[PDB]
């Protein structure tokens, strides 16, 4: 069943029921205008709107253009019969298209049902129609028949492509916001459509070209219908409730009014810009209005002005407002049904839902402004089908939304000249001249802090009882049909219906052309530096903005100097074709570049050119940009820092019931539930603030990146075309070059770069959200949790205390996880948030790492990282920090005071890699010295050391102390914990236990539940305190703190990640290095050392022991290691300029005998699988297999060497075979068929203390 | 034999390389600093309360010799038969014990 029945053409007679001359209300006297009814209470008037508004009597453009991004003005539109018929067909087709959709069907049914309320009677016990909510259709006989209607569609006013929904007001009553409702006249035109540009679609169609998409008129008509539906039930927000912004700064939009009504109508992302408190206020206000009108309906008992019985009218209004009578004629509202109706009219009917149902493109947010005016034709079915629209099926327009792309579907949209000039509303920026005008619609959107309000501070009292397409489909089944208010005979009114439109608030004109004087080159300056005029003279690229803005015929570019040198070079025809291909290759190379440094937290893909592209942070070096990025987080991208402040959350007042057993458990359950509700509400408020104030800037930066890339591509294309133009005719025809393919490939390269830029910006936005916004709310929530826990425990103070205490302790000890999926519905951002949550390090609280010649807290919780003047950093790997026993060899960490909560350190983890040299002096015995301190007022946790012991101490105010110790002996042949890197992690849970793991294996655990008040601290002291030994020192690196207990799996994952398996390691655990002599030790036989025997072909190398003994009585006794012939590793094919060896490197091995080097080689032709190794003079024969590939992974198994032949055949793993009595060294292929193939490199170290005799 | 026993008290032997064989002697409160015993024979010689210092023992063969209450510091015992049982109540300091001749030799 179609919506509009029996299509009307235009020139059908004046019958009087479906096509007739009508007289709408107006200020004075108006000639009757032919209007056609398309459905119940819906009329269309194919005429220009010059009747309702007496001021709008002219069709010429006004002298002062409106604050509008795009607008088309016309005078001859809709003046001919063909134009009116085309308008009618377009409107009817759009109505049918909306009606087909289930959501559209519900919207049209609701609009038809919702007639305006009859409140025109002065006496309170009567119902009378509003005189301004009705029309007069004049019959051909001569008299008129006054009729009541709901919607009217009129062609647009002077502004052709300005669509709005007007209403006729009353003298005292606000019909559109008090629930009474009033008729809505929509100014809509289907022949014209705004055009936008979309740059976030490549995720589905990478083959797509440029943007320039055309808005589907069905969506616009749906938006107007939603406005009419809101105003028909009288629940529209007052127009003065407007989303105010700031305009003083130079980076702010001069003026952009957006009422709360538009935010409600847009829905989706836009509707989140209004906090929950204002939604609650509006819902309560409109509930009170509905109750008031229900009471008014109840009181009245008489009706004047119509034949129809009163009971029918009361039933009509009851089914419109979903009132609930109780068989006694007593109408009343119920909260459930009104909540359902309000949610349907506010949240279900939204433009985003219509976009999803129609499956068409639209601007996801109102910030993505329109750009052009497109004249379109809707009547023919070959251009716009009823079911699909511009995306016609079974054609090339079916996929990738090619039906809405103006550059593919050119024949369907005609571009028009919009009257708002590109520089009509601008801001004039310049430095201390070169002043540039920047369009107002190309500036950052900065909402004020007034629009966000909180009721968090206000307290709450608890008593016994204190409490998606599938959802749309469920509403569709639940919806009621088949009941549409039947047409009612109304006694005819006066010939002229006097009535004035609803009064609108006055909008002051924002000032134009404000002059700003700054001290730096802003991003708009860089963007306007890259533009040019497509002039006749040659255009040359340059790297100096100070000259690009000054000289019109020279364009700035952020690419490398080689590219600008190339594109500026005069090339003959014989090399032109090669030149173009080289140019496109360099374009792809520069745009697709990425940043290797990844130690950053989820900013893995850093795009360097962005720095010089916009002058981000006011540095013009890509390396400087990456350094500043790593140093300062995602703050440098933001133009202005949002100010987020959560008030102290209110307390929970618990009522006590006398001698009751069930209600108290209900109070406890209610308290826990409301705790969860408070957590969710604070998280939602923070998400709303972040979406309103942060993501908009990132989106603008993304759009500006796209614009800059387009500008660079256009500049290169213009240079190429100008060079082509210079040739002679024979040169052009012999050497043929076309522009379309070049443009297509440059566009594809731009898209390829744009994917990476989008990923980087999404990662930055999510990182900022989870780093600089969430903690400020988590602190408040957990402080509130601690405050509520004591009140609950006091409240428990019948016969069920133990279970309740366990429940409350376990409930409030932990925290509710933050999952973004419950607050936003953006797939692209949710994927990156899941990636952020995946890594454990990203959720750490303190993440001290050395990056870009600075020791910084990558988790951004620390305020001051103070470094002493006697703290050493290893030059090869600067992460390893060496701390001495000096008063000035300390590191201090001062955390942010507004992030640290009092009840921290209840469930938390710590992890660090530590290297402790051997204990030499006898003073070290029975001497405990703190190496990490976080105690204030004798309370907190400290990591201390002792003779062969690592101690973790937890102490409370009452002087109670709990210690967990890990003890390793020094009197062993070979030790895995003496002067070797060990990964110590400690996990404390206040409820059950505190445990310490060494190298990812549980070592010790002890209860801590007896402790009292462990009052948290703020400073962290990396300093050796109380150590009596004067030369004592330690190595510490990769310190990390976590705000939750860590299970064994996470500990093992941390050990695997931080181990850095890509780099082979020596005995002590450092990085293996080239051109360094290491002694060799075999793990299979650690009691024997490698020795050489008659260097040359006829000699070999074997293993002989025992190693020996190094002793200090009463202190230590360890087998000597600096024994045997030293091995050095000379590079062979490593392209890296550093001397650090890595996995699968190919290397040469030299053995030192009598301070002379011999290459480690063998002859592989000898019989048997075993190939005994030998040492040969470096001027040897290259035919012998000598190249050794070093491996450290299979799971990692130490450091293994694999002898390879010169032809790539694998001779096999190095190792030892007991070839007769003498245990020789061999390259065996048995070891390749996986011990004895695992080796350890022992370099001379100053922490071991053995003298290499 | 026992009549010709040489008692040594308060010695200060600095930078001396020992190459011959010394027999039938006792040393008390000796301070052997930077000495060197290479390829020699120890015969019926006793050390008590002697303070060694960075001395070097190489290819030394001992018979009935016994160290007592000696402070032995920074020494190297390479290619020797001076096993553990020849040391009685002795304190080593930063010392070492490398390859050691197998079996006693007389
Ligand atoms: C005594 O020392 C000297 C100097 O090194 C050496 O030439 C000589 O051979 C040593 N005596 C004996 C018996 O070896």
Author numbering:
A (entry chain B): 1 to 432, 452 to 486, 495 to 824, 831 to 1227, 1231 to 1270, 1278 to 1296
B (entry chain A): 423 to 528
The authors write:
Botulinum neurotoxin A1 (BoNT/A1) belongs to the most potent toxins and is used as a major therapeutic agent. BoNTs and BoNT-like proteins share a common domain organization and are produced as precursors that are cleaved into a 50 kDa light chain (LC) and a 100 kDa heavy chain (HC) that with the exception of BoNT/Wo remain connected by a disulfide bond. The LC is a zinc metalloprotease that specifically cleaves soluble N-ethylmaleimide-sensitive-factor attachment receptor (SNARE) proteins. While the physiological functions of SV2 proteins remains to be determined, their best-established role is to act as receptors for several BoNTs (BoNT/A, /D, /E, and /F).
To elucidate how SV2B interacts with the toxin, we prepared SV2B complexes with the inactive full-length BoNT/A1 (in the presence of a 20 molar excess of ganglioside GT1b) and HCA1. Although applied in excess, GT1b was not detectable in the complex structure with the full-length toxin. The SV2B-BoNT/A1 and SV2B-HC structures revealed that the HC domain binds to the LD of SV2B, extending one β-sheet of the β-helix fold by the antiparallel β-hairpin located at the convex side between the two toxin HC subdomains. Unexpectedly, BoNT/A1 binding to SV2B resulted in a switch from the semi-closed to the open conformation, the domain arrangement that is observed in the crystal structure of the isolated, full-length toxin. Because in the open conformation of the SV2B-bound toxin the LC and HN are far away from the synaptic vesicle membrane, the role of this conformation appears to be the prevention of the interaction of the two domains with membranes and premature translocation before the toxin/receptor complex reaches its proper destination. Microscale thermophoresis (MST)-based experiments revealed a high-affinity interaction of SV2B with BoNT/A1 and HCA1, with very similar KD values of 110 nM and 180 nM, respectively.
